[PDB]
């Protein structure tokens, strides 16, 4: 007795997955490859990026192309679009800004954060949405942050840039959904990525605590009692990119184990 | 070259799907049956309910049991729980309250709406959540309404009862997610169900317009330019019920084609 | 200086559940702006004392209704004393905390009656007169838990969220006729009830009252509890002729404790 | 009657972009409560006239700074005139409407500079003094579009939402030191700019001004546009000593037009 399970309907489509050699972006890449989506993946570090592409090719039956570039620069965006001029799916992602107190920031800190986490996604949407509209199908997913719903004092630069992206997305989403293009944001709370692990160990050593003690501290503030996985993050991305999600647009899906306490 | 696609991981589990011989509830039932979930489906009208169960059995490889009862009464809830004492998945649903002006309502109108669309789901959660916790897995999905986010003047009884359910769910969701139980709400905007079609035709005849003219009027207020399908509603339900959604809880997923204009 | 004239002197306000705490703060602030009052509470001697104090401090009239506002006969008593209010402040005691697995159907109905249907019915009874006169101000005291429900407050989370969704729909319907409906959502305010509850939970836990107060206050970014005076001041502003473009609002007075952007 | 004393007589407010419209309404309302003002705008003759009018009506001092507040030298001019404000009202002109497919990178940067980074930098320059004095009130004029973005307002949707998320984080950090940071979100207010814009879009479309006004007003449940006086009254209330438990709030003054519950 075999069960049909869920065919997301997007085999043969193409996705441009930004910032995706590791972490959540890689989780989205893998989940889309398993649905038969051909990939162009972007990251800055060439040897890690090509290793990830090797591995996804082995693990899936799709094509994978790589672009080694800084997606937050004009030249990097041009290189990504040269390699993937007409994506059906765009996953926006880039490294987040540094923590600190805004009184200690220079103006250029704001500009860099706005470029990386707001204007870069907007520009890649600008560059790709008309082809999606012309084909009657498009899926744009922006990786943002649970901080959009509950800003953290020390993350001023992210609170601002990502809330700016979110406000822009809300307006555009309603304009293009009738042409078959959806635009939605995935808001991760704390996910078990290598970057998070590296940061945790540095923070433990700076406080004098063991890594286990600091891990437990973070987890106690998450009702789910665990960190998120890049796999379940990628699964939600793949569902938003599916033919079953064409009525869902401008949404901000919070994947945070219950941590944020608001009703909405 | 066959693609893995998405295995929701819930084959062999059991779902109690309320109010599910037709419409959105039937859409959830079918989507769960395709993932290999055995069903107990509830509705009041026996012959329609048994026809739906016949059809789902033919269409899927799962078992389907029926309970013909009014789920908004104590006896009906008891009959549903006798038939499905330990569900892994609970889909809460029931008919919505009548439209009108609250100045014309009697007290009993409020009580009936609160019973049907708030206390009935709470009681079925009360009756089933401890077994979910004991097994380390539970998925509760409540069908509510886009009105929760943007209340309509003439839907006072739904605005109130469903917002009450939503507030209760937000608090409980954070309490049980660490035990493997999630509780989330699906907020439909306008979906193409037989009830909606019947209501539209009555409204057209009461206004003197053709059905096509009234259909178009409603659609012009939906940016997606179409009504929702019970299939895509069921797909979102199945994804929330999957092993890929254990980090998602207390959320209010709006499936409305962009119609509600808020950022959040 | 031309200080702020809220323009409501000589209007009449029905202030529910207002011999003490936040309701009393609303009554004091409205009387200070010249509003004649009818104040409701169950316990006669506290009610009369509070009325006497307000009347002596403000020279408005202050009628009292000793009744349980969450019952139909109580609402009839209150409406008989104030059949045509310009201003209605909805308020009543809150439901008991606990685990929803231990709440009966009747517990749910009591909470819904007290904190959702009672305000709806008082609005139902008074709004058409406000409309007819081209002015009305309805303020519902709810709870910061409407924005961030706590698991132990299931009954409040449900009933007050229901009121909040109802209010959202009605507010838009009547604002063009000069009636606004807004909710005030208190976080922790230093009412005598809260103070007594703290001192009991202190001596119960074996810590002092000051120790428990510090624990509560650590979770409030403003570093203090709210005062009934500032709660009443916000209510008076909503009631003013300056607030007729403000409706369906949920003003959080919680010292920044709720973390959400919205 | 003891009318409402907001307790801010003799404080000093820096009011940005305030020779006309909502900023002017804020300045008028604060002066009426005894607050000394420094008001900023670009055009000298309008700025002086508005200052003269406020000074004559309120007997506070009203200094003027003729500058473009969205440039670094403009901010330096404003801060030189008002280095230690108790109250800061952030405001500037809004960005142009249009299709984001036609906006350049520089268009985005101009909007972000004008409606997000300018207020952040003015907060950055003034908040530590507020903290040191144990009192501060920061009010940011944003837009009802922050709650419901319009596709033609992409630049505003982005920049003002960014400011709003930044403010949410900072508000909780400083409220314990007596500083509140809140946003006022206007829906359609009858400022002379709006009126002129309407009369041009009227004669352009071939309809009269009254016809276009009726079309706009049909979509506002309150049935009217807002007034700068009531906008300024809300700003003054937030600035008061009664509003120290209110921070990080986004008060929608839009006559009920926005349909959301929250
Ligand atoms: N993980 C969480 O708990 C969490 C929570 C909230 C928000 N977020 C946000 O989500 C995003 C992803 O986080 P993550 O933990 O998955 O990060 P990650 O583990 O560090 O992965 C980032 C990936 O993007 C690439 N990349 C980074 N900056 C890039 C750039 N300018 N151009 C091109 N590729 C770039 C990195 O490779 P190269 O370094 O080789 O370029 C790597 O492949 C970040 O913006 C983060 O702030 C994450
Ligand atoms: N469809 C939309 O556009 C839309 C939008 C917003 C909200 N909603 C809400 O979503 C829910 C589902 O709507 P729908 O359009 O799918 O409704 P539907 O097409 O009428 O289906 C309702 C189903 O539930 C059963 N049912 C109704 N009341 C019941 C009760 N007391 N006990 C047991 N079974 C019951 C009905 O069969 P019997 O009559 O035989 O019992 C039928 O199987 C409603 O609460 C509705 O108000 C729907
Ligand atoms: N203070 C806070 O921190 C806070 C925070 C969140 C929510 N709230 C909610 O705000 C409301 C007011 O709280 P509070 O602290 O001001 O309470 P309070 O100090 O206990 O004052 C309650 C007032 O209402 C009267 N009252 C209570 N139930 C009544 C009824 N059924 N009929 C008529 N009068 C009634 C009481 O007098 P009698 O007993 O003589 O009738 C008293 O005058 C409550 O619902 C509470 O749950 C308060
Ligand atoms: N009124 C509404 O319906 C409404 C609704 C939503 C949002 N908003 C936003 O609220 C703000 C105020 O709107 P309003 O209608 O009050 O505008 P207004 O009537 O045009 O007033 C703008 C005031 O700011 C000054 N100003 C503008 N840009 C400036 C700059 N760069 N530096 C210094 N002063 C500057 C103007 O004088 P100068 O030109 O001489 O400098 C004038 O005194 C705008 O950002 C607008 O987009 C307003
Ligand atoms: Cl830490
Ligand atoms: Cl209609
Ligand atoms: Cl405690
Ligand atoms: Cl127009």
- Say if residues C63 and C78 touch (Cβ distance below 8 Å): no
Asked if the Cβ–Cβ distance from A159 to D149 is below 8 Å, we say no
Backbone φ and ψ for D22, nearest 5 degrees, come out as -60, -40
To the question of whether residue A162 is assigned a binding role by annotation, the answer is yes
* Angstrom distances, CA of residue D6 to CA of D11, D37, D240: 11, 16, 5
C228-238 and D228-238 helices, crossing angle to 10°: 180
* Angstrom distances, CA of residue B252 to CA of A255, B89, B210, B248, D25: 12, 17, 35, 10, 39
Q: Which residues of C touch B123 (CB under 8 A)?
A: 105
Please count the other Cβ atoms lying within 10 Å of the Cβ belonging to residue C216.
Answer: 13
Backbone φ and ψ for B205, nearest 5 degrees, come out as -65, -35
Could you give the CA distance from residue A83 to residue A96 in angstroms, rounded to a whole number?
24
Would you state the structure tokens that stand for residue D189, as one six-digit string? 């207010």
Q: Is D153 on the interface with A (CB under 8 A)?
A: yes
Which ligand has the minimum distance to the alpha carbon of residue D198?
A: 8
Could you give the CA distance from residue B246 to residue B249 in angstroms, rounded to a whole number?
7
Q: Is A19 in the pocket of ligand 1 (CB under 6 A)?
A: yes
Backbone φ and ψ for D127, nearest 5 degrees, come out as -70, -35
To the question of whether residue B195 is assigned a binding role by annotation, the answer is yes
Q: Which residue has the tokens 């104030």?
A: C82
- Residues having CB closer than 6 A to ligand 4 are D 17-23, 40-43, 46, 68-70, 91-94, 141, 143, 186, 188-189, 191-194
Would you state the structure tokens that stand for residue B223, as one six-digit string? 């940016």
Q: Is D216 on the interface with C (CB under 8 A)?
A: no
Question: Residue C123: closest CA among chain B residues belongs to which residue?
Answer: B103
Q: Is C21 in the pocket of ligand 3 (CB under 6 A)?
A: yes
Could you give the CA distance from residue A174 to residue B88 in angstroms, rounded to a whole number?
36
Question: Residue B104: closest CA among chain C residues belongs to which residue?
Answer: C124
Residue nearest to atom 37 of ligand 2 (CA): B43
Please count the other Cβ atoms lying within 10 Å of the Cβ belonging to residue A217.
Answer: 14
CA B20 to ligand 1 center in whole angstroms:
43
Backbone φ and ψ for C260, nearest 5 degrees, come out as -75, 155
Which ligand has the minimum distance to the alpha carbon of residue D23?
A: 4
**Taking chain B, what is the end-to-end CA distance rounded to the nearest angstrom?**
41
Burial pattern B129-140, b for ≥16 Cβ within 10 A else e, equals beebbeeebbbb
> Which of B167, B224, B235 is facing A263, going by the closest CB pair?
B167
Residues in chain C followed by a break, C to N above 2.5 angstroms: none
The whole-angstrom distance between B228's CA and the closest CA on chain A is 7
A46-59 and A23-34 helices, crossing angle to 10°: 30
Residue nearest to atom 28 of ligand 2 (CA): B95
* SS3 state at A205: helix
Helix (H) or strand (E) holding A25: helix A23-34
Residues 6+ apart with CB under 8 A from D135: D11, D86, D178, D179
Asked if the Cβ–Cβ distance from A178 to B8 is below 8 Å, we say no
- Say if residues D6 and D241 touch (Cβ distance below 8 Å): yes
Could you give the CA distance from residue B191 to residue B115 in angstroms, rounded to a whole number?
24
Distance, C-alpha C151 to centroid of its chain = 22
CA D18 to ligand 4 center in whole angstroms:
7
Q: Is C71 in the pocket of ligand 3 (CB under 6 A)?
A: no
Q: Which atom of ligand 1 is nearest to the CA of A117?
A: 45
Q: Is B218 in the pocket of ligand 2 (CB under 6 A)?
A: no
Q: Is C188 in the pocket of ligand 3 (CB under 6 A)?
A: yes
Q: Is D258 on the interface with B (CB under 8 A)?
A: yes
Q: Is A21 in the pocket of ligand 1 (CB under 6 A)?
A: yes
Q: Is B185 on the interface with C (CB under 8 A)?
A: no
Q: In what order do the strands lie in the sheet with A138-143?
A: A64-68, A38-43, A14-17, A89-92, A138-143, A181-188, A252-255
* Angstrom distances, CA of residue A66 to CA of A11, A14, A20, A37, C18: 19, 13, 10, 15, 68
According to the entry, how was the structure determined? X-ray
Would you state the structure tokens that stand for residue B235, as one six-digit string? 């797909």
Please count the other Cβ atoms lying within 10 Å of the Cβ belonging to residue C77.
Answer: 17
Residues 6+ apart with CB under 8 A from A197: none
- For chain B, the farthest-separated pair of C-alpha atoms sits apart, in whole angstroms, at 63
Half-sphere exposure of residue C189: CA atoms within 13 angstroms, side-chain side: 27
E runs forming strands in chain A: 14-17, 38-43, 64-68, 89-92, 138-143, 181-188, 252-255
To the question of whether residue A171 is assigned a binding role by annotation, the answer is no
Q: Which residues of B touch D149 (CB under 8 A)?
A: 261, 263
Could you give the CA distance from residue B112 to residue B108 in angstroms, rounded to a whole number?
6
Question: Residue D262: closest CA among chain B residues belongs to which residue?
Answer: B149
Q: Is C252 in the pocket of ligand 3 (CB under 6 A)?
A: no
Q: What does DSSP assign to residue D94?
A: P
- Say if residues A243 and A9 touch (Cβ distance below 8 Å): yes
Would you state the structure tokens that stand for residue D68, as one six-digit string? 């473009």
> Which of A151, A163, A262 is facing C148, going by the closest CB pair?
A262
Would you state the structure tokens that stand for residue C193, as one six-digit string? 């009830």
CA-derived radius of gyration, chain B: 18
Residue nearest to atom 18 of ligand 4 (CA): D21
Which ligand has the minimum distance to the alpha carbon of residue B230?
A: 2
- Mutate which of B24, B68, B165 to test ligand 2's pocket (most atoms within 8 Å of Cβ)? B24
- Say if residues D232 and D27 touch (Cβ distance below 8 Å): yes
* SS3 state at A177: helix
Convert chain C into a string of H (helix), E (strand) and C (coil): CCCECCCCCCCEEEECCCCCHHHHHHHHHHHHCCCEEEEEECCHHHHHHHHHHHHHHHCCCEEEEECCCCCHHHHHHHHHHCCCCCEEEECCCCCCCECHHHCCHHHHHHHHHHHHHHHHHHHHHHHHHHHHHCCEEEEEECCHHHCCCCCCEHHHHHHHHHHHHHHHHHHHHHHHHCEEEEEEEECCECCHHHHHHHHHHHHHHCCCHHHHHHHHHHCCCCCCCECHHHHHHHHHHHCCCCCCCCCCCEEEECCCCCCCCC
Cite the DSSP H helix spans in B36-100: 46-59, 74-83
Q: Which residues of B touch A248 (CB under 8 A)?
A: 236, 253-255
Please count the other Cβ atoms lying within 10 Å of the Cβ belonging to residue D248.
Answer: 28
The whole-angstrom distance between C224's CA and the closest CA on chain D is 8
> Which of D153, D159, D168 is facing A171, going by the closest CB pair?
D153
Pairing relationship of beta strands D36-41 and D62-66 according to DSSP bridges: parallel
> Which of B114, B155, B166 is facing C112, going by the closest CB pair?
B114
* Angstrom distances, CA of residue B21 to CA of B85, D8, D40: 20, 64, 66
> Which of C4, C34, C236 is facing D33, going by the closest CB pair?
C4
Chains that touch C (3 or more CB pairs under 8 A): A, B, D
Could you give the CA distance from residue B128 to residue B131 in angstroms, rounded to a whole number?
6
CA D85 to ligand 5 center in whole angstroms:
35
Would you state the structure tokens that stand for residue A55, as one six-digit string? 């591995």
Would you state the structure tokens that stand for residue C261, as one six-digit string? 């952007």
- Say if residues C19 and C92 touch (Cβ distance below 8 Å): no
Asked if the Cβ–Cβ distance from C154 to B168 is below 8 Å, we say yes
E runs forming strands in B71-177: 89-92, 138-143
Tell me the β-bridge partners of C12.
Answer: C36
Between positions 94 and 113 of D, the ones with CB within 8 A of A are 100-101, 105, 108-109, 112
Could you give the CA distance from residue C33 to residue C53 in angstroms, rounded to a whole number?
15
Question: Residue A160: closest CA among chain C residues belongs to which residue?
Answer: C261
| Size of chain A, expressed as the number of residues it contains | 264
* Angstrom distances, CA of residue B99 to CA of B104, B105, B159, C127: 11, 10, 10, 20
Chains that touch D (3 or more CB pairs under 8 A): A, B, C
Angle at A190 between CA A188 and CA A193, to 5 degrees: 100
Half-sphere exposure of residue D46: CA atoms within 13 angstroms, side-chain side: 12
Half-sphere exposure of residue B168: CA atoms within 13 angstroms, side-chain side: 33
Could you give the CA distance from residue D184 to residue D243 in angstroms, rounded to a whole number?
14
Taking one residue from B and the other from C, the number of pairs with CB-CB distance under 8 angstroms is 100
Angle at C211 between CA C205 and CA C212, to 5 degrees: 55
Q: Is C142 in the pocket of ligand 3 (CB under 6 A)?
A: no
- Say if residues B177 and B240 touch (Cβ distance below 8 Å): no
- Say if residues C161 and B164 touch (Cβ distance below 8 Å): yes
Residues in chain A followed by a break, C to N above 2.5 angstroms: none
Could you give the CA distance from residue D163 to residue D138 in angstroms, rounded to a whole number?
13
* SS3 state at B186: strand
Q: Which atom of ligand 1 is nearest to the CA of A68?
A: 33
- Mutate which of C21, C24, C121, C222 to test ligand 3's pocket (most atoms within 8 Å of Cβ)? C21
Tell me the β-bridge partners of C41.
Answer: C66
Domains and CATH numbers, chain A: 1-264 (3.40.50.720)
Burial of D86 (0-12, 13-18, 19+ CB in 10 A): buried
Angle at A150 between CA A146 and CA A156, to 5 degrees: 90
Could you give the CA distance from residue C49 to residue D4 in angstroms, rounded to a whole number?
24
- Say if residues C122 and C67 touch (Cβ distance below 8 Å): no
- Say if residues A66 and A41 touch (Cβ distance below 8 Å): yes
Q: Is A174 on the interface with D (CB under 8 A)?
A: yes
CA C196 to ligand 7 center in whole angstroms:
14
To the question of whether residue B168 is assigned a binding role by annotation, the answer is no
Q: Which residue has the tokens 């808001």?
A: A187
Phi-psi region of A187 (alpha: psi -120 to 50; beta: other; left: phi over 0): beta
Residues 6+ apart with CB under 8 A from A104: none
> Which of D159, D165, D262 is facing A151, going by the closest CB pair?
D165
Residues 6+ apart with CB under 8 A from A169: A142, A183, A184, A185, A250
> Which of D1, D34, D252 is facing C249, going by the closest CB pair?
D252
Could you give the CA distance from residue C38 to residue A195 in angstroms, rounded to a whole number?
62
């Amino acid at each position: 007795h075999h069960h049909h399970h869920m065919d997301l309907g997007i085999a043969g489509k193409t996705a441009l997955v930004c910032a995706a050699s590791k972490g959540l972006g890689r989780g989205c890449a893998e989940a889309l490859a398993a649905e038969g989506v051909n990939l162009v993946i972007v990251a800055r570090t060439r040897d890690t990026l090509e290793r990830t592409a090797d591995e996804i090719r082995a693990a899936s039956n799709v094509s994978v192309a790589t672009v080694a570039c800084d997606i937050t620069t004009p030249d990097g965006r041009a290189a990504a679009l040269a390699a993937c001029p007409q994506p059906d799916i765009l996953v926006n992602n880039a490294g987040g800004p540094p923590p600190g107190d805004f009184r200690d920031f220079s103006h250029d800190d704001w500009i860099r954060a706005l470029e990386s986490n707001m204007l870069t996604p907007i520009e890649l949407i600008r560059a790709t949405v008309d082809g999606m509209i012309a084909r009657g199908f498009g899926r744009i997913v922006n990786i943002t942050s649970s901080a959009v719903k509950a800003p953290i004092d020390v993350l001023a630069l992210s609170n601002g840039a990502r809330s700016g992206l979110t406000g822009f997305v809300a307006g555009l989403a309603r304009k293009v959904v009738g042409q078959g293009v959806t635009i939605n944001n995935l808001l991760p709370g704390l996910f078990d990525t290598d970057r998070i692990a590296t940061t945790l160990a540095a923070a433990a050593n700076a406080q004098g605590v063991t890594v286990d003690e600091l891990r437990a501290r973070r987890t106690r503030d998450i009702p789910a009692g665990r960190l998120g996985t890049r796999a379940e993050f990628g699964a939600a991305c793949a569902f938003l990119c599916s033919v079953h999600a064409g009525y869902i647009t401008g949404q901000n899906w919070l994947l945070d184990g219950g941590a944020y306490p608001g009703t909405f």
